[PDB]
């Protein structure tokens, strides 16, 4: 019927070798060999395009069919060639790519092409079930080819139904793949769409003769039927006569490194930070330079210098756990967990989206309600406790062997360990020198080392997840924090007795019993809302209100704590490695005024405080104590203090906050829509629309707190315990991951025993975990000492890192030392210790009943015997499986 429908008819009639010769006849191709190679090796600094797609967009660009600018959206990004190419264009500023990925579909590639810092690619996205957004440049390369034009037509029509909603937000530039432009209905539709939205159809010469696909580009203008049919003629012409040679063009070289970005970064108080910036620069004057292409938006940039790379993207498998957990070799929830990428590119790709942010200052009335509540809470906590200076001797007894040294300057680089440095008088001379500076209104050495935390986390793009920032100062600068504010931790100011709502010093054992009490109290549902990246959300004003403890100190102590807060918390100098162009690595010197650093001595103690103030303010807003106008100006501040004195403690004792983790049991469910103050303080809730009311729990046993949910379980005799539970896959997955590279079988086997024993103490109620832990304990030599880290948690008290009998250690934590356990009758055998209900166990990732597990259980005795030979026969083992 149409010139293209004719071409498709002919193409379908083609034989295998007719088609073969035809497909590339007189087409254009980019020379992709050099790119394929580097990509196989993983050379992100090559400037190589991730796909052919990059040249398909450079072609339209040079002709004037597309002039990308501003906010660029890549719908069906795949590897992201259109995305990475977009980021090189002088007028584009942000580039967000979205793709399906996973099985059978292409996943975003992580290259360091010029401007990679303005690219955010996302997988597991089905654009047909994604709401439109306003953008400046709209790109969409979706269209799976088919043998039937009936299938290609319905495939194109669905794609244009999708972009219609996007295009009515009027993007300035657009490029949409039109797979089937040649059918009557498709010509009819495209004319109607060209009328309504503009642009036109262009055929790319880089395309094979096997597709009639054209791109609906913003810079084109031509009758759609003239455009479609001139290209149909081309394709028909290429069928008849001899085969023409293919034309080869050199591929696009994007380049390498980050792009220069628009700054909204607050001005540095150089009178405070200047001496440290100038000291760093003098110890690095040979390499020190100012990078024009630094990627810092909200941080002040002070300079960079050539420095060696640190960290790795490597994850290893704990063969021991892997062999004893065969039914999970399938489960992607477990097999998908691995080490995080702590390399300079690994951390910086998270930094740019999560840490390089600037939260708008809260309003004056909000700023005041915060101040009233914070003064009240500091006065309440200090009622029974006195601030005090913590000592050198207190610190020595507290400092571990595994504690970071963090040496930044020449004079601090004298020791190889923290344990060695504290036993050196030359160290304490440095501490004394800095305190002298602090007392002279100066800071010379309190600079933060920032890097990626090596954690076990689920992956992204079939690759290791990027790493979260961890920032601590050097040992000496940390002691000065300790001596001024360490009283908060050491004298347990955030403990549940002193704070009512805190949980400092409690283990996962006890945490469940708190939420059980909390449920008995009348009121609404329980609300466990996560603040999306709490530390980054800590404002100028939050730090101001925190510094209100300073009033309860003696003038000298206040002076010391004030110099720490003002020069180290209110103002910060951060040292970070960043990947540069040419495969080089630079160390950057940046600074900021808001936010919390993870490695501050009183980070948990302050996050806890500020979170209680936040929760208290939400209860006032909910109970209608705070009004709509009270954000701008606090009308009648007396109403705040009256509420606090009447209900302050009663509401506090209805909370459980551990740093950034919280659970509030309000008076009613008005708390769910009490978001005005919440959002004004920048405490924006995680994975919810900024104004959609919060979702609460009617069942306390379902409430998430500290990565867990807690269950009341009753013994054989009848007594009860409130145990910690989480999804089994998170547990087996993390157990199956090995940190340290180049490990002897002992190092792996001993970390497998640590996981097994932790499971025996906290997760004994999970049927699979008790079995697998007994299997691990049976396959690993008995006299081998458990090693490594099983949790980074403050509530994971490491009672399982012992050679002692686990049934003895279990009785000690659940009976003997359990303050919620009246009867001290010890449990004599493990068969008395119950399991979670079969519905609950199965709800949290259990495989009871599934035949691959059922088989696994039956032959565990033999698979243990196998792992015994793997670790070595000649070793002494014991059977914990009978
Ligand atoms: N419903 C959908 N939602 C999102 N992406 C989809 C999709 N259907 C297909 N895709 C993806 O769209 C991509 C089309 S190919 C895009 C190529 C890209 N412009 C480049 O330069 O590499 C494929 O990777 C496919 O998996
Ligand atoms: Zn200092
Ligand atoms: Zn559970």
Author numbering: 6 to 887
Sentences from the paper on this structure:
The nonstructural protein 5 of Zika virus (ZIKV-NS5) is critical for ZIKV replication through the 5′-RNA capping and RNA polymerase activities present in its N-terminal methyltransferase (MTase) and C-terminal RNA-dependent RNA polymerase (RdRp) domains, respectively. The RdRp and MTase domains in flaviviral NS5 proteins are reported to cross-talk with each other to synergize their RNA polymerase and 5′-capping functions.
Here, we report the first X-ray crystal structure of the full-length NS5 polymerase from ZIKV in complex with S-adenosylhomocysteine (SAH), with the hope of aiding efforts towards the identification of antiviral drugs to help mitigate current and future ZIKV epidemics. Unlike the JEV-NS5 structure, the linker region (residues 266–275) connecting the MTase and RdRp domains has continuous electron density to enable modeling of all of the residues. While the domain positioning of ZIKV-NS5 contrasts with those reported for DENV-NS5 structures, the individual domains in these proteins share similar structural features, as expected from the high sequence homology among the flaviviruses. Some strategies that are likely to improve diffraction quality include truncations of the currently disordered N-terminal (amino acids 1–5) and C-terminal (amino acids 888–903) residues of the protein to promote different crystal packing.
